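Before surveying the methods themselves, we first show a specimen of the format, giving the amino acid sequence and backbone structure tokens:

:::
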Amino acid sequence: SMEILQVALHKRDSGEQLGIKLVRRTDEPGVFILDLLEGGLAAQDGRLSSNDRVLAINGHDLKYGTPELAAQIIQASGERVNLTIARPGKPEIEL
């Protein structure tokens, strides 16, 4: 199963970073969160997580996107950055 959620972050100036490390994978399409940077906007917000898939930013489709396309969108954004995410899998497993 997967959870779909929306997260809105607000830049205090046009050059502020979100504090996210985005990666591609060779074995599946998409853009994924690897980790959040210490003290950044995303970490402060507390909703985004490692292994989340970024489906869209501000209505711009990223399903088959790249980290560089995400960077372009974010760097050119307005103050509000809305991310639509997919979060797969079980959070706890006994094995």
Residues 55 and 63 are 5 Å apart (CA to CA).
